[PDB]
Ligand binder design. Structure first.
Ligand SMILES: Cc1ncsc1-c1ccc([C@H](C)NC(=O)[C@@H]2C[C@@H](O)CN2C(=O)[C@@H]2CCCCN2C(=O)C2(F)CC2)cc1
Lengths: 145, 89, 104
């Protein structure tokens, strides 16, 4: 795959800072490009973690897999530590579209078996079922490279 | 600021900045199709929330300051989704 | 600090922002630009309470905490019809429908 961690073996200390109201799932892209989940971060909590230069991370809502931002972008790559200072990973909500935000709230309230029963145009029904998904997003991100 | 008027199906008039309303490609087209727009299909409890979204989005796009959740009450979520789809917001 | 407002009269609602330090009178100037009624033909309210021209929005209780982009604070507006002021009136928004079964 194109999006994968480089096996640098060069330690990089990182702070995962969760400045979102979501439970955050950190996801490491391993050396084959397969997404590997890591332990979750409660809202407003921090964690010191040991990673490596050239490693790829992205962050999701643990419950729903909604995309989150890290340093105002999607992917975080640990870099060189200056004066032993860990790299801050600021995890934030994006500005979701009004449509996506509505989709999130409706999915949170309605069992997926019942989407078809909602009184909406069929195109919006297809949009509810097409949940956020790491596998989907890497294809998009890989092509935009 | 130049303002524009957005009118809900029940006759409520929401007056918002022009710059804010052009966030919506649909509204931009409706205004260049004048500075007032009528929405036969969007009631005031939905259109009011849409206007708050404009304010919210303009405030927080490209902001390092931590972003709060855009709140949507369940009762209106369904109608707001349909409006967002139409307005492409 | 910016404060985010809805200025409401009858079936009219203006979305605008202002500085915490700006005055009731300066907000009337905003309304004048939009609704073409001079400050002196305007009354502004917090809930039922008439606001004084010279006071800041902060002192009237519009703060960044309470007057947020996604939840703006409401200012009531009443016009002086010719001689005398109408009572403050504000139409509520429409009522949402019942939650569907599959959402309850
Ligand atoms: C508690 C918690 N909350 C949120 S994350 C978290 C958390 C928990 C444990 C860790 C552990 C100590 N470190 C890692 O897994 C780092 C993070 C990323 O670089 C992948 N990797 C690694 O350590 C990878 C993958 C596992 C085998 C070794 N490895 C290497 O590259 C080598 F050297 C060449 C072999 C890191 C974070």
């Amino acid at each position: 795959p194109v999006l994968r961690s480089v096996n640098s073996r060069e330690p990089s200390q990182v702070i995962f800072c969760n400045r979102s109201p979501r439970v955050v799932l950190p996801v490491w892209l391993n050396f084959d490009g397969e997404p590997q989940p890591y332990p979750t971060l409660p809202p407003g909590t921090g964690r010191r973690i040991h990673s490596y230069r050239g490693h790829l991370w992205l962050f999701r809502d643990a419950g729903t897999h909604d995309g989150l931002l890290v340093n105002q972008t999607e992917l975080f790559v640990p870099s060189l530590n200056v004066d032993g200072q860990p790299i801050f990973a600021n995890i934030t909500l994006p500005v979701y579209t009004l449509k996506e935000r509505c989709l999130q709230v409706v999915r949170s309230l309605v069992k997926p078996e019942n989407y078809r029963r909602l009184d909406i145009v069929r195109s919006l029904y297809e949009d509810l079922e097409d949940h956020p998904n790491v596998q989907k997003d890497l294809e998009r991100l890989t092509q935009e490279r | 600021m130049m303002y524009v008027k957005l009118i809900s199906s029940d006759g409520h008039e929401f007056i918002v900045k022009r710059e804010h309303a052009l966030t919506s490609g649909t509204i931009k087209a409706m205004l260049s199709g004048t500075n007032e727009v009528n929405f036969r299909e969007i009631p005031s409890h939905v259109l009011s929330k849409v206007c708050m979204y404009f304010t919210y989005k303009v405030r927080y796009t490209n902001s390092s300051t931590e972003i709060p959740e855009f709140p949507i009450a369940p009762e209106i979520a369904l109608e707001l989704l349909m409006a967002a789809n139409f307005l492409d917001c | 600090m910016d404060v985010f407002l809805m200025i409401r009269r009858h079936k009219t609602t203006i979305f605008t922002d202002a500085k915490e330090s700006s005055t009731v009178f300066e907000l009337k100037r905003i309304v004048e630009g939009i609704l073409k009624r001079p400050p002196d033909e305007q009354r502004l309210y917090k809930d039922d309470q008439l606001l004084d021209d010279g006071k800041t929005l902060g002192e009237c209780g519009f703060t960044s905490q309470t007057a947020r982009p996604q939840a703006p604070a409401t200012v009531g507006l009443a016009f002086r019809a010719d001689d005398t002021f109408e009572a403050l009136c504000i139409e509520p928004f429409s009522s949402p429908p019942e939650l569907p079964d599959v959402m309850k």
